[PDB]
């Protein structure tokens, strides 16, 4: 009935924004604070009411020895990259997956490609082109989810809210089973 969820990924990919959208979607409405550490949110998925305890690693991306103190007893990981940052996707296999598999051995991972609203954004394409890069394609996220053994792959926009509810439903199912 209580499941611990930890959200990880590079700085500025939208970890906190995703927690905010989910927490503002709760009913009855509650004031959503600025930080998420053992933050209790109730969700109903399929039959069951579940308490999700949310932990955000934003602000700790460069504190390699302090960040893993939040990992014990985790039930599901949300591992996030940004579709507007191929660098953040490359850190999925190179940084986040080895870390999560060491500290959370058999814990399900949901791979989340956030900022999907920027895939066709003209400003984003122009800025990425300066570095000889382009937005992440959906096939690339799906392939990465298979490579790292993720339970599932989902694309979201915290800005438009599309896909956010579905990410948390999938994470709850994975935590339950
Ligand atoms: N266009 C767009 N911007 C986003 C999205 N999610 C977050 N952002 C923005 O990206 C920036 C970083 O978001 P934040 O939640 O603080 O990332 P965190 O460091 O991973 O916790 C903020 O300026 C947000 O407005 C999204 O889905 N689309």
Author numbering: 4 to 180
From the paper:
Protein members of the Rho family are major regulators of cytoskeleton organization and cell morphology. The Rho family GTPases are crucial drivers of tumor growth and metastasis. However, it is difficult to develop GTPases inhibitors due to a lack of well‐characterized binding pockets for compounds. Here, starting with molecular dynamics simulations of the RhoA protein, we discovered a relatively targetable cysteine residue Cys107, as well as a potential compound binding pocket, which is close to a functional phosphorylation site.
Compared to wild‐type or mutant RhoA apo forms, the alpha helix with residues 67‐74 was disordered in the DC‐Rhoin‐mutant RhoA complex crystal structure.
